[PDB]
Design a protein around this ligand. Structure first.
Ligand SMILES: *[B-](O)(O)[C@H](Cc1cccc2ccccc12)NC(C)=O
Lengths: 95, 10, 131
C-alpha cells in the first residue's frame, strides 16, 4: 500500500446502469461509482466517498466492494449512507 | 462539518 | 486507489486509518464527530485495533498524529456478510479525537438527500495503487 494518502474524483452511476455490470448483486443500500479510469482497491475499504453539497463535503458512500482485480473500467460498490444514516442517528443517540 | 481548514486540490 | 493522485496533506481531515496492534493499515474510516468513526462492517474491526487520525504519510515519524483506542464496535445488525449489503460499522472511541486544522468531521446526508448519476465525487484512502 502507498505511504501517502491518495485521492481520486469519480462519477456516481445509477443502480440500473450498475446492474449491467454486477447484475443482482447490487442491492438498495448500495451505490456505485467509478468505471472512469480510477478504482478503489484493497486497503481502501471503510473509507469515504464524498460529494460536495451546498458547499460542504458530505458522506455519500463507504468503500465496500468491487472488482477482484480493481479494474478501472468496472464500477466500484459503496455502502449508500443515505440508506443507513437513520441507523447511525439511533446508535449515536442511545450510546 | 464537511469544510476542511486545508482546502483539497483536485 | 488505482490511478489516483497524492492528496494535499491535511485536506481530508475526517479520513482515519484503522491499524492493527502491529501498525499495519487494513482499512479506512471517517470521523463524524470527536467520539465516533464510521467504517465498513466487512473490515472486521476489534477493540485491539487503533484509529489513527491526522496522518498523511504512514512512513513518516514526525507527523503529530492521534492514535485513538476503540471502546466499542457497533456492527449494523442488518449487515449481510453473504451479500455485503448494509456494510457499515460504527466505532465509539474510548478517547475522543482532538479537532484541529488536520482533524475534523465529515457531514452526514439526510435520508432524503439526492445525489444524481453523473455527479463527480471524491474517494480517498491508502489502499493498493496497483493491483
Ligand atoms: B476492502 O476490504 O479494502 C475491499 C475494497 C475493494 C476491493 C476490491 C475492489 C474494490 C472496488 C471498489 C471498492 C472497494 C474495493 N473490500 C473487500 C470486500 O475486499
Amino acid at each position: 500500500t502507498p505511504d501517502r494518502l491518495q485521492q481520486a474524483s469519480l462519477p456516481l452511476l445509477s443502480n440500473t446502469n450498475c446492474k449491467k455490470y454486477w447484475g443482482t448483486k447490487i442491492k438498495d443500500a448500495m451505490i456505485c461509482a467509478g468505471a472512469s479510469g480510477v478504482s478503489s482497491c484493497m486497503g481502501d475499504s471503510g473509507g469515504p466517498l464524498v460529494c460536495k453539497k451546498n458547499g460542504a463535503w458530505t458522506l455519500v458512500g463507504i468503500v465496500s466492494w468491487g472488482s477482484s482485480t480493481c479494474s478501472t473500467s468496472t464500477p466500484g460498490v459503496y455502502a449508500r449512507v443515505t440508506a443507513l444514516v437513520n441507523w447511525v442517528q439511533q446508535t449515536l443517540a442511545a450510546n | 462539518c464537511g469544510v476542511p481548514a486545508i482546502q483539497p486540490v483536485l | 486507489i488505482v490511478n489516483g493522485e497524492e492528496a494535499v496533506p491535511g485536506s481530508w481531515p475526517w479520513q482515519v486509518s484503522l491499524q492493527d496492534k502491529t501498525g499495519f493499515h487494513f482499512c479506512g474510516g471517517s470521523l463524524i464527530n470527536e467520539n465516533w468513526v464510521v467504517t465498513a462492517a466487512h473490515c472486521g474491526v476489534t477493540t485491539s485495533d487503533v484509529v489513527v487520525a491526522g496522518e498523511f504519510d504512514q512512513g513518516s515519524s514526525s507527523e503529530k498524529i492521534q492514535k485513538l483506542k476503540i471502546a466499542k464496535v457497533f456492527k449494523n445488525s442488518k449487515y449481510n456478510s453473504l451479500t455485503i449489503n448494509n456494510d457499515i460499522t460504527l466505532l465509539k472511541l474510548s478517547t475522543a479525537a482532538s479537532f484541529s486544522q488536520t482533524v475534523s468531521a465529515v457531514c452526514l446526508p439526510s435520508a432524503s438527500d439526492d445525489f444524481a448519476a453523473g455527479t463527480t465525487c471524491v474517494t480517498t484512502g491508502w489502499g493498493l495503487t496497483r493491483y
